[model samples]
Target: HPPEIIRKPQNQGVRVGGVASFYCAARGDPPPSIVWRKNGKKVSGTQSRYTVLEQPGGISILRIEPVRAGRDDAPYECVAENGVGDAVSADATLTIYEGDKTPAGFPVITQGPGTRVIEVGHTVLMTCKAIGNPTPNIYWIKNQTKVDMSNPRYSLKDGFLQIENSREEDQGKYECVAENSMGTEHSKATNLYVKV
Candidate 1:
């Protein structure tokens, strides 16, 4: 069986220059390895900006330094795997608010680019919503690669990634990134499951 999560990480809301922490717990057959991610990239070891704590009971933590305004505040995820199967935790957002009680910098998703399941030759649209101060534009990525809607097979409009006549190769991880002057925001990294 795959690793099971015992404790779900709680989201944190902090003021600028404050600290934030997240924890995850899991268990599996062969013992799963733990890893952390911030904005969809792997986070490793102790750093000037954050510290990682790993416990024996399938628990792991990620603690950040005094939160930075346009930076630091982002979504985090924890993953556990045993090479047999893997498990991903829910996204825990580190919401940062300013002294004036307004959120500062970068756009964040309000809705989502949720997972989709479709049959071959069917259409698929990966979409989400986000808001920001300086305003933000969305970008779509498939399996770590940027999606160029320039191709006829793809059409991007109204925050939706339209895939016309989806194919087998079209199945993979898809995400929407929102960006502006402040910083960038990450999606939940949805999977598109296809069946022929």
Candidate 2:
């Protein structure tokens, strides 16, 4: 079957230094590959301010951190393709405003963890990035409970949640939490399956 877009990105408004995100979802027989585009060019995931996270069930997110007023305000689109057909999402505009004009807001999760499978004794890193007015603090939750920071095997760096010497006990649903002065935000829950 050819690719069909199920969810599309929408227009968003953000502060100059805040974060913005767009979600795109598609379905196909062989599953489609997804990419973000700006001004008819492919937006690279490697860029410092941009993060692309692909989740299960054909969902993809494009996150922009610390968006600039003039540089980041533009129309962005998501493109999905398989060998059979290509699908393009509607152009979504990212509108940027001054800090004084926009009121303080809650944290916005830019990049969230994706469900993944890993072998035992190996290492795994769960991605989580967020932005807010006063800068958000990030945390991890396992099986609906907050993860312990004192655990030796668990560590956090930047926005990534790392688990070293992975054990079967570590296999569970994980979620990213971000808190700011305005409010708190939670990302979509995802699974971490460990293989013996």
Best by TM-score: 2
lDDT of 1 by residue, 1-196 (tens): 7787787776766657654567788888878777888899988765687778776788787767567988887788887777875675667777786775744755767877887898999998777788887778888867555676787989877877899898998899887877665545567678999999
In model 2, the worst 10-residue window by lDDT is 97-106
Instruction: List CA RMSD, all candidates.
Output: 13.1, 10.0
- lDDT score for candidate 2 against the true structure: 0.81
Candidate 1 yields a Cα-based lDDT of 0.76
lDDT of each: 0.76, 0.81
**Judged by lDDT, which candidate is best?**
2
Model 2 C-alpha RMSD vs. true structure (Å) is 10.0
Against the correct fold, how does model 2 do in TM-score? 0.54
Clashing pairs in 1: none
The TM-score obtained by model 1 is: 0.50
Model 2 Cα lDDT, one tens digit per residue, 1-196: 6687899887776667766677788888778888889877899989899888877879888888778888988889888888665565667777777755654765778889999998999999999989987888898878655687799999998968999999999999998877665544567789999999
